[PDB]
Write a protein that binds this ligand. Structure first.
Ligand code: FES
Ligand SMILES: [Mg+2]
Ligand SMILES: [Mg+2]
Ligand SMILES: [Zn+2]
Lengths: 118, 164, 23, 37, 194, 80, 137, 8, 146, 47, 43
RNA sequence: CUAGAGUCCAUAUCAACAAUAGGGCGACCUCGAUGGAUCAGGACAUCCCGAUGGUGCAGCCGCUAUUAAAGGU
RNA sequence: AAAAAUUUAACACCCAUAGUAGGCCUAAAAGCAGCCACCAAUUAAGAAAGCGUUCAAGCUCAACACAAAAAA
């Protein structure tokens, strides 16, 4: 589910990823939204690369990293899994997902006027 | 003494940062504390002056009528006063915000619902309803709200029933 | 009295008139 | 439009709004009053 | 005479006699012309600087045009340009100004707001920081600043350290800071600092 | 717009929404546009009636209402 | 419309002061110089008069007239032909209270629909204060 | 039903 | 509340206004939220608190009607628009990247192309500066600029 | 110019607030001192 | 990009420097130590 | 900043006295070997081409502003 | 000893008659070309604070009511 990652704040349209092909006039800068649309797994791949140690081992370490945009995982890869790590950020609950038990548990805070159109 | 802000030494910079002012912080933001009771305001000269002439108008003259001074040009208002002046009718208007207390504590509290927005008070002696309903017959957009015929509260049809 | 406050109101507009000189 | 770091309303009909992360002065009676910071 | 007197460019008779040394006329608080004399509204110098003749003639063309002799008057508080400036090949006189100096004084049968309207416009065009000030705003500003030292919750202040040589910090502090109290730095001055 | 009529008894409550309505529509500032228009006020249940020359009818009972929406609803039907 | 101004009784067709001025208003130039002359001689002529002509689209003239202005009609009673210059210390006219007692009764007809008599005398004396006259007794 | 220090 | 109905006949009816809870823990307060000891104990995640001050279509109630703290009404305004564009209020719609803690509108921010040096580097803000006073259970203060 | 420092005599007055804060008795001053250098002598004046 | 004219730590246009949280924490704890020293030297 | 030009009119355009920002004399390295041709890389503070506001923009021409360096000069 | 902070502009609603173009100077300049005085009708209105007219006309206000950035 690397396609469904979330950025805090406006990092989708503020953060950019600049690369150079080496030819004259070859400087290219694209934003996170453009990169994610073009490549759903590029964001996670680049984030890990910058945090890995900057030595010859980094290339070998990335060979043990596997990314998949959607819930589909290959059968061979899924067959050798051992442990599912917990998600770091707790997913906020939408307003509709709250059940009736907790909605009425939360008390009201104000008295609405009777004759207000709303 | 320079013109380029005279970049500061690191040791001096730390000294200024440590010795920065710290305002005192209350335990409870005063704004969310049961506010102190509001101080009553002194009554101005106008309020006492209007009340005594409001009382004098209310007692000296028999006819007190309720109307609304709808949006009208000054010339039309002036002639409306003139057409009332031909039959010894005098026109007086008072601020409504101050009429509310003067009416509720007296016997005439039944006229509170009439006085909400713009109001016109028609005051005359020896009332004769036939003449000024004719003057309001030629003007379709000026309605008679009500009034009292010698402390007898009546609606518009009550004024009309007295006319004939 | 009534004439005292009418003069007082005349002073207030006089004050506002001066305050709008540099407006 | 004209670039002005400080926006001033040159008539009573100039309405000031924030559009595209930028304060704008818009006018209809006098289109020359339009401003942009 | 409710108008600004003509100010000459260069002293008619050069009187270059200097009372002390140089470069010390911009740093430190002003010692003269600090209170209000025969006036109610003035402009306060929130920092040191030099006043060139163009600034003086600037005072003329922005104050007198927005002036009425009938109900308003103004006069000079800073002296005429007497300190010259040497100019080597790749001249003119200026008035030294310290922080807290009063540049011009105004008054009459008028309120602060009307005088504020044009005074602030002039205030923003001096080389140093300045702002319009009245006989009430100045004392209010001074009392507000004085209140700061009493409600301050910081146990450590500039005077408690510089005078006592707390951290051996007088090595990096000038001897002039025993009186500047850390609120003054070069030609600048920060009222916001305690 | 041909004829507008207002009917209200000021002696009860909830008549203030339509009482202030008169001070806006029954003004020469807006009546000058249609000099031949008709404005009549009779006093008896607050309610106003609006008649159009095309044949459209309008009934606006401002008991549980306010003047601001009454003014806006009047403007919407001007297009018709 | 309303074009309220002052009309000189002696002059009927001033020309440039009145011809081109109301030319854009769309009024009959010759209408003024015929009927106004009859209204000129009903009372003492040679005094300025107000105007009450209302301009209608159908090109009609209805001019009302009451009492003359307050400049000449007051200054003539004090025997002064030119108004004061300083108007604060310079003064050459004197009028008594009895003099005003007949100067305000006629004026209180340009409905000036005020009922009380004090409302008329107070207005002119305030106007008289601006002019260079003295109020005697 | 709620103590003075209650917090929803 | 009162609703208008059009069929020309129009009408207004009153239907089942909600009621305030009868026992506020901290009385003597002129404030809806600053009466339940909730001054610095809510965030953009709390939809239940935020949903009580919004129009059905996603707007905000005026201050004079709710009587909130002047500075807190700003916080409620800022928090609600954060939740609306975070997908937390899907039923209050007007008339695809998932985000959270978004201070500004997504379609009104210019991407940074030449970030500054190590001493003058432009920062991409997260959260809101109005929530500084919110309580923190970690001694590291909120990082409002990433 | 950087010279020696003349510490004001007002600094060394033990107010009653400091007495119970540090636990010292003005009536019975301590007999001896314990001194421990906790800063480098380098980057400091020769005196 | 990001050149500093002259040298980094000396010159008219130096590299700007700011204090940190622990930089303050170290200064106060040193100030408190002398406050103990100031009191014990007064008897 | 709004004195002053622009018939009127600060702000279509121009602009005084001033103020605030940004751009690239010293002897620190080297005393033991400028023009044109050709090829051009880059910035935009845009000469031309493009999109869009204002105008003392009727239309053609113009003036001023915003954005745009893919291409040409 | 030793880790930088910081994100900035909505806003009144309604209303207006009148001694009169207040006098002087001005071709005429009226609340607003300039000057001298600045009262006063009316519930409530400056002998006028701004635009506007050759000058008038026309409008609002006052009054009653309700804090920037750009180079290879
Ligand atoms: S009193 Fe606390 S929210 Fe207003
Ligand atoms: Mg270098
Ligand atoms: Mg460009
Ligand atoms: Zn405009």
């Amino acid at each position: 589910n690397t396609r469904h990652i979330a950025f805090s704040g406006n990092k989708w349209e503020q953060k950019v990823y600049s690369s150079h092909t080496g030819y004259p006039g070859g400087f290219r800068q694209v934003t996170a939204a453009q990169l994610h649309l073009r490549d759903p797994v590029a964001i996670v791949k680049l984030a890990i690369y910058g945090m890995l140690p900057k030595n010859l081992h980094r290339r070998t370490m990335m060979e043990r990293l596997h990314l998949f945009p959607d819930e589909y995982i290959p059968e061979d890869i899924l067959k050798n899994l051992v442990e599912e790590l917990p998600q770091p950020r707790k997913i906020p609950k939408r307003l509709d997902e709250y059940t009736q038990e907790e909605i009425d548990a939360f008390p009201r805070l104000w008295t609405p006027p009777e004759d207000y159109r709303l | 003494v320079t013109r380029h802000r005279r970049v500061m030494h690191f040791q001096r910079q730390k000294l200024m940062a440590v010795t920065e002012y710290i305002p005192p912080k209350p335990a409870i933001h005063p704004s969310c504390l049961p506010s102190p009771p509001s101080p009553p305001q002194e009554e101005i000269g106008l309020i006492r002056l209007l009340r005594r002439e409001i009382a004098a108008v209310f007692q000296d003259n028999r006819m007190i009528a309720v109307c609304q001074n709808v949006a009208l040009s000054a010339e039309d208002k002036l002639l409306m006063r003139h057409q009332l002046r031909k039959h010894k009718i005098l026109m007086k208007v008072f601020p409504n915000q101050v009429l509310k207390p003067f009416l509720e504590d007296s016997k005439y509290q039944n006229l509170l619902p009439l006085f909400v927005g713009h109001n016109m008070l028609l005051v005359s002696e020896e009332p004769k309803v036939k003449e000024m309903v004719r003057i309001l017959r030629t003007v379709p957009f000026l309605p008679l709200l009500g009034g009292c015929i010698d402390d007898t509260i009546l609606s518009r049809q009550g004024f009309i029933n007295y006319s004939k | 009295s009534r004439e005292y406050w009418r003069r007082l109101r005349k002073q207030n507009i006089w004050r506002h008139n001066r305050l709008s000189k540099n407006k | 439009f004209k670039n002005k770091t400080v926006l001033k309303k040159r008539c009573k009909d100039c309405y000031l709004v924030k559009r595209r992360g930028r304060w704008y002065v818009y006018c209809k009676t006098h289109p020359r009053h339009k401003q942009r910071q | 005479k409710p108008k600004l007197r003509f100010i000459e460019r260069a002293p008619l008779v050069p009187k270059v006699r200097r009372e002390p040394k140089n470069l010390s006329d911009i740093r430190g608080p002003s010692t003269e012309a600090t209170e209000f004399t025969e006036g109610n509204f003035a402009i306060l110098a929130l920092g040191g600087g030099y006043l060139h003749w163009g600034h003086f003639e600037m005072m003329r063309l922005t104050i007198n045009r927005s002036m009425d002799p009938k109900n308003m008057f103004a006069i000079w508080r800073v002296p005429a340009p007497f300190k010259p400036i040497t100019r080597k090949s790749v001249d003119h006189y200026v008035t030294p100004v310290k922080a807290g100096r009063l540049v011009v004084e105004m008054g009459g049968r008028c309120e602060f707001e009307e005088v504020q309207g044009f005074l602030d416009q002039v205030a923003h065009k001096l080389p140093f920081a300045a702002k319009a000030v009245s006989r009430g705003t100045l004392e209010k500003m001074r009392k507000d600043q004085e209140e700061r030292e009493r409600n301050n919750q910081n146990p450590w202040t500039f005077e408690r350290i510089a005078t006592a040589n707390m951290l051996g910090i007088r090595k990096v502090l000038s001897p002039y800071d025993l009186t500047h109290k850390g609120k003054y730095w070069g030609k600048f001055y920060m009222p916001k600092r305690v | 717009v041909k004829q507008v009529r207002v009917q209200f008894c000021p002696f009860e409550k909830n008549v203030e929404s339509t009482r202030t309505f008169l001070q806006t529509v029954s003004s020469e500032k807006v009546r000058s546009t249609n000099l031949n228009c008709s404005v009549i006020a009779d006093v008896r249940e607050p309610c106003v009636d609006v008649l159009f020359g095309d044949g459209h009818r309008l009934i606006m009972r401002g008991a549980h209402l306010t003047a601001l929406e009454m003014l806006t609803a009047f403007a919407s039907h001007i297009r018709a | 419309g309303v074009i309220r101004a002052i009309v000189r009784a002696g002059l009927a067709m001033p020309g440039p002061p009145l011809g081109p001025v109301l030319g854009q208003r769309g009024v009959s130039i010759n209408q003024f110089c015929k009927e106004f002359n009859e209204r000129t001689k009903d009372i003492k002529e040679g005094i300025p008069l107000p105007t009450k002509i209302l301009v209608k689209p159908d090109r009609t003239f209805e001019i009302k007239i009451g009492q003359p202005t307050v400049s000449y009609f007051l200054k003539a009673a004090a025997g002064i032909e030119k108004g004061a210059r300083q108007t604060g210390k310079e003064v050459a006219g004197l009028v008594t209270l009895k003099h005003v007692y007949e100067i305000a009764r006629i004026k209180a007809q340009d409905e000036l629909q005020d009922v009380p008599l004090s409302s008329v005398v107070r207005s002119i004396i305030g106007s008289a204060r601006s002019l260079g006259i003295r109020v005697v007794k | 039903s709620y103590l003075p220090g209650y917090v929803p | 509340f009162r609703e208008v109905v059009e069929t020309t006949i129009i009408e207004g009816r009153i239907t089942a206004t909600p009621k305030e809870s009868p026992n506020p823990p901290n009385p003597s307060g002129q404030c809806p939220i600053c009466r339940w000891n909730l001054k610095h104990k809510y965030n953009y995640d709390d939809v239940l608190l935020l949903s009580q001050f919004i129009r059905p279509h996603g707007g905000m109630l005026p201050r004079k009607i709710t009587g909130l703290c002047q500075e807190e009404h700003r916080k409620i305004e800022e928090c609600v628009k954060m939740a609306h564009r975070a997908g937390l209020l899907p039923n209050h719609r007007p008339r695809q990247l998932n985000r959270y803690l978004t201070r500004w509108a997504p379609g009104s921010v210019k991407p940074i192309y030449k970030k500054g040096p190590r001493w003058n580097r432009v920062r991409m803000p997260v959260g809101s500066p109005l929530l500084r006073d919110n309580v923190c259970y970690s001694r590291t203060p909120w990082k409002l600029y990433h | 110019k950087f010279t020696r420092s003349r510490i004001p005599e007002k600094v060394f007055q033990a107010s009653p607030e400091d007495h119970e804060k540090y636990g010292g008795d003005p009536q019975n001053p301590h007999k001896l001192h314990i001194v421990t250098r906790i800063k480098s002598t380098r980057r400091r004046p020769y005196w | 990009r990001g050149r500093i004219p002259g040298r980094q730590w000396i010159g008219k246009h130096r590299r700007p420097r700011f204090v940190s949280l622990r930089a303050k924490q170290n200064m106060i704890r040193r100030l408190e130590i002398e406050a103990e020293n100031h009191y014990w030297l007064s008897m």
